[PDB]
Amino acid sequence: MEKTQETVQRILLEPYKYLLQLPGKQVRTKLSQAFNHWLKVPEDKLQIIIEVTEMLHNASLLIDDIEDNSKLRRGFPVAHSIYGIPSVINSANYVYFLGLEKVLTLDHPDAVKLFTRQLLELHQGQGLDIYWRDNYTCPTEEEYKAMVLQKTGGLFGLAVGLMQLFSDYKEDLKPLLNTLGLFFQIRDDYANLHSNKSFCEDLTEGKFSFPTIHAIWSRPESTQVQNILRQRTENIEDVGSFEYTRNTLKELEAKAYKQIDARGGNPELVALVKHLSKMFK
Amino acid sequence: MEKTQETVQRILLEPYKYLLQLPGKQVRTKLSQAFNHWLKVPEDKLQIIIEVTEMLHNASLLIDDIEDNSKLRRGFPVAHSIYGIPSVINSANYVYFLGLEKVLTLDHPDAVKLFTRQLLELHQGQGLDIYWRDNYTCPTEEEYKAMVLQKTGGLFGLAVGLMQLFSDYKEDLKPLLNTLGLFFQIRDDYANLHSKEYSENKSFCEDKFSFPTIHAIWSRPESTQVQNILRQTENIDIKKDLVHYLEDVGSFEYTRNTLKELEAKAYKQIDARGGNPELVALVKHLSKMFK
Ligand SMILES: C=C(C)CCOP(=O)(O)OP(=O)(O)O
Ligand SMILES: [Cl-]
């Protein structure tokens, strides 16, 4: 049972390990560690939380790449181009439940409730993202943000919320988490599209991210075009798109620094935000 | 957030609601009812468990159809032809977590543990099935059986396990569950190759190994007639060929014998648990297929 449980687990995890070994930032690791400046979670619990968070993050990327027909991830072919969609779905989903299993080792009665809630949020966000893309209905800036706070902030919320289960630190971290979730997402959007080639391809495909959203709604005919496209569904700043994105990022950065200062400072979190902000300067 | 949650929910669940309308046997409900002879679960808990089980099962079917590249289910388009693979993955996975959420309403400390274990088993079984197919690894009979017990019985095991959490009856039903899991799957394998009526109702217009072909491959290890037949004819012809080869090597007889042993074992194990007329009658009816 040891030798072949281990073979099975290794087989099932192959697509996931492919992605995990690619060069990446582990921002969720770094964020959680920086947040522990406030929360003072014991190392053993923190390690579990970080593992859960990174597991779910990587698994969700496998799924994301299938859901939007991406070709590359972290510079390399997406897992499903190598292993097939079937094995990748299975692998990513297996990791979700291995994440659940690991949450149970936290031995806290609220942990599973929080994990369930955050996974449901994540799927709501993802599901909207997909729906818009499939119907070519470009979200507004505000719709995009709300979706991102579910799809991206869902996991940030899980890490910090699980930490809060093991901490007497009671300050409201939700505003800062919202800022950070938007910041990270929009920064990714910017990093992916700033060098026309990916940008134009996105527009062709109906792949919506912060720069293309700005570009689409910038044209006056946008409203009437988008309204025709939204009738098919259950759907309700004169500057360049990259400049607008850079400006949004600078605002989000400044806001983060304000919110960190409002919580008494956090040099490690500040240094992380500053490093990540080089991307758009 | 009130009127809006409902819209989003409906978007997310559309592929799942489509699949709910498709023909199906609802055996998991029938087996749960049969196990309730012993377990006598309070109706409020039983209703939740059955809903959880059916949700997880239907979600797994959405995923299964993507994972094995099915084109039809019971003669109708697979969900992902209608809604696309991205929406279906998202829908099925959302339902998994809605299932988790509902398991929490059972308010028993062991329910989530059971859920986790059984979902992990399900994924291991599915994952092996996929791996073998993708990597041209023909399993042995013993490996196939072990895979089937995970893939086919993972959710069966969850239903009964969750039931037993709210039952005074605490005897070990796992051996019987294993026998039943194998029996159901191998009977399906058999019926799908040996019975035109059963094939027509279930796998209408469908072209992936199974108990009989595994026996045929490993019993005549030098032959490659199975592989060669599958690589060839429109499916009626391919199937005839496969069927004749299986006939000629004794794979149908071997499968019938395996099923008879599984049947007899089930009756012995049911008797050892104190008897269960409903389950016995169901096994007997299902056993006609191979008599
Ligand atoms: C939801 C989002 C924004 C995914 C991208 O995250 P990362 O930029 O952290 O990707 P890796 O470093 O983990 O590759
Ligand atoms: Cl510190």
Descriptive overview:
It is classed as transferase. The entry lists the keywords Isopentenyl transferase, Isoprenyl synthase, Isoprenoid biosynthesis, Isoprenoids, transferase. The assembly is dimeric. Two copies of one chain form a homodimer. Chain A has 281 residues and is mainly alpha-helical. Chain A has one domain (11-280): Farnesyl Diphosphate Synthase (Orthogonal Bundle), CATH 1.10.600.10. Helix content of chain A is 74%, strand content 1%. Chain A has 15 helices and two strands. In chain A, strands 1-2 form a two-stranded antiparallel ribbon. In chain A, strand 1 (72-73) and strand 2 form a beta hairpin. Chain A is globular and about 60 Å long. The interface between A and B is large, with 40 and 38 residues. Bound molecules: 3-methylbut-3-enyl trihydrogen diphosphate (IPE) and chloride ion (CL). Residues 24-25, 27, 74, 152, 184-185, 188 of chain A line the site of 3-methylbut-3-enyl trihydrogen diphosphate.
- The CATH superfamily label of chain A reads Farnesyl Diphosphate Synthase
Helix-strand sequence of chain A:
HHHHEEHHHHHHHHHHH
Number of helices of chain A: 15
State the oligomer. homodimer
Residue fraction in strands of chain A: under 5%
Number of strands of chain A: 2
CATH topology of chain A, what is it called? Farnesyl Diphosphate Synthase
State the end-to-end distance of chain A. 54 Å
Largest interface: A-B, 40 and 38 residues
Total number of distinct structural domains of chain A: 1
Largest beta-sheet details of chain A: 2 strands, antiparallel
Identify the bound ligands.
Answer: 3-methylbut-3-enyl trihydrogen diphosphate, chloride ion
Structural class based on helices, strands and sheet pairing of chain A: mainly alpha
Largest beta sheet: strand ordering of chain A: 1-2
User: What is the 3D shape of chain A?
Assistant: globular
Q: What is the top-level CATH class of chain A?
A: Mainly Alpha
Helix content of chain A: over 70%
PDB class: transferase
Keywords: Isoprenoid biosynthesis, transferase
Assembly: dimeric
Entry title: Structure of mutant human geranylgeranyl pyrophosphate synthase (Y246D-C247L) in complex with isopentenyl pyrophosphate
